[PDB]
Design a protein around this ligand. Structure first.
Ligand SMILES: N[C@@H](CCC(=O)N[C@@H](CSCc1ccc([N+](=O)[O-])cc1)C(=O)NCC(=O)O)C(=O)O
Ligand SMILES: N[C@@H](CCC(=O)N[C@@H](CSCc1ccc([N+](=O)[O-])cc1)C(=O)NCC(=O)O)C(=O)O
Ligand SMILES: [Ca+2]
Ligand SMILES: [Ca+2]
Ligand SMILES: [Ca+2]
Ligand SMILES: [Ca+2]
Ligand SMILES: [Cl-]
Ligand code: NA
Ligand code: NA
Ligand code: NA
Ligand code: NA
Ligand code: NA
Ligand code: NA
Ligand code: NA
Ligand code: NA
Ligand code: NA
Ligand code: NA
Ligand code: NA
Lengths: 209, 209
């Protein structure tokens, strides 16, 4: 510590890490970058890959949202109890990222023309997570093992934004539906999800959701 | 162990993990899935995300090429020496993956019309790695720290396929070009790169490179 998130004024690729920090009782500073500031081209060339988020943990500076999540998972004990679980958590998180990338492409480049196709294909992309839950204590714990991990926070965020895109998309995924309800009721997450800083933040930068 | 790689008959997303295994003196089985077999639709529904590679390590079955890389990195001691290095290796590997995804899209969907633009944009995407090398012992060690890591095997593979796609792409990146030469000279890597199994395997599945 201390922690600083440097990002556009959206939920996007930072809401999962924010929920993680909140659920761990951690404070952090937000440095909000506006689009007009970004277009001036001062900050962008100083970012490793030209993009946000940028994240500071003490004198450690990171880019890449999933590297930040993994770092928080490693440093706060949210990465499983052994190597087998850590590998499975990575396999989950990579699957979350694959679907998130498709979501972002829909939202930002093809919303009107692509949404129907996307929603029709969505059950096939959610089923793997239902299956994973079914095989871990019949789905009554977390996505891997019996302790929450960085992958849970990312998966939870992914599921929540998809419930906005496609209400009832979890109607046929009972384990995922109960998992979302359960994690959402964790007191520090419930408080985060009703906090003004989260509620007033749009999901994406173009207002579509 | 023992290790099995289940994958299409290409280098693709498995040549980095193959190099890693070869360099660490490990043996593995290749279960090659032809296009004809894959299109029979028997194996695909049993894969977690409907895709390959699939990886078996004793009784652990994994998917997701980067999760497999991280699992081999964790279990074989190729993940740095502290939390700081591990986070930086993740930030590197996520950048490698971002470019790999763009490479795959070019190869399989848009080679003829997209190649000129892709090659024009390539230096901008390789520069971050030259910069990281320039800040870690003037490029004479590895991408993070002074021990080879899973991120090195992935970055090496990314650079090698880009040298075939765009000869001379490292001409203005002397650290990256020296790094490719040095790591390719590691005796077990050089032997793997000379082996008929690798030499006869096409980079991609569509005859383009
Ligand atoms: N692989 C990276 C991907 C990061 C990424 O896509 N960053 C986008 C922001 S998230 C998506 C996004 C885009 C725009 C806004 N906005 O408010 O205008 C918000 C969010 C970015 O920096 N874009 C600016 C650029 O490339 O110059 C990661 O996981 O962190
Ligand atoms: N995020 C995943 C991405 C895996 C992926 O793209 N898998 C591709 C194979 S790699 C690219 C590829 C495509 C085709 C061949 N080929 O020889 O026919 C080889 C490699 C796949 O399974 N495609 C089949 C499908 O989706 O049904 C990862 O990192 O492992
Ligand atoms: Ca985003
Ligand atoms: Ca789309
Ligand atoms: Ca591939
Ligand atoms: Ca499976
Ligand atoms: Cl819970
Ligand atoms: Na905001
Ligand atoms: Na997002
Ligand atoms: Na997020
Ligand atoms: Na990632
Ligand atoms: Na996925
Ligand atoms: Na080592
Ligand atoms: Na990404
Ligand atoms: Na593909
Ligand atoms: Na392209
Ligand atoms: Na360009
Ligand atoms: Na070494």
């Amino acid at each position: 510590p201390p922690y600083t998130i440097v990002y556009f004024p959206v939920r996007g690729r930072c809401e999962a890490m924010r929920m993680l920090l909140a659920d761990q009782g951690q404070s952090w500073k937000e440095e909000v970058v506006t689009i007009d500031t970004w277009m001036q081209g001062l900050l962008k060339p100083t970012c490793l890959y030209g993009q946000l988020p940028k994240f500071e943990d003490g004198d450690l500076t990171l880019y890449q949202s999933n590297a930040i999540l993994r770092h928080l998972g490693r440093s706060l004990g949210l990465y499983g109890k052994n190597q087998r679980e850590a590998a499975q958590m990575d396999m989950v998180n990579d699957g979350v990222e694959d679907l998130r990338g498709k979501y972002v492409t829909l939202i930002y480049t093809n919303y009107e023309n692509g949404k129907n196709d996307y929603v029709k294909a969505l059950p096939g992309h959610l089923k793997p997570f239902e299956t994973l839950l079914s095989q871990n204590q019949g789905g009554k714990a977390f996505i891997v093992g019996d302790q929450i991990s960085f992958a849970d926070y990312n998966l939870l965020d992914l599921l929540l934004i998809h419930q906005v895109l496609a209400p009832g998309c979890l109607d046929n995924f009972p384990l995922l539906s109960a998992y979302v309800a359960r994690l959402s009721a964790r007191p520090k997450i419930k408080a985060f999800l009703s906090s003004p800083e989260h509620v007033n933040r749009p999901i994406n930068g173009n207002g579509k959701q």
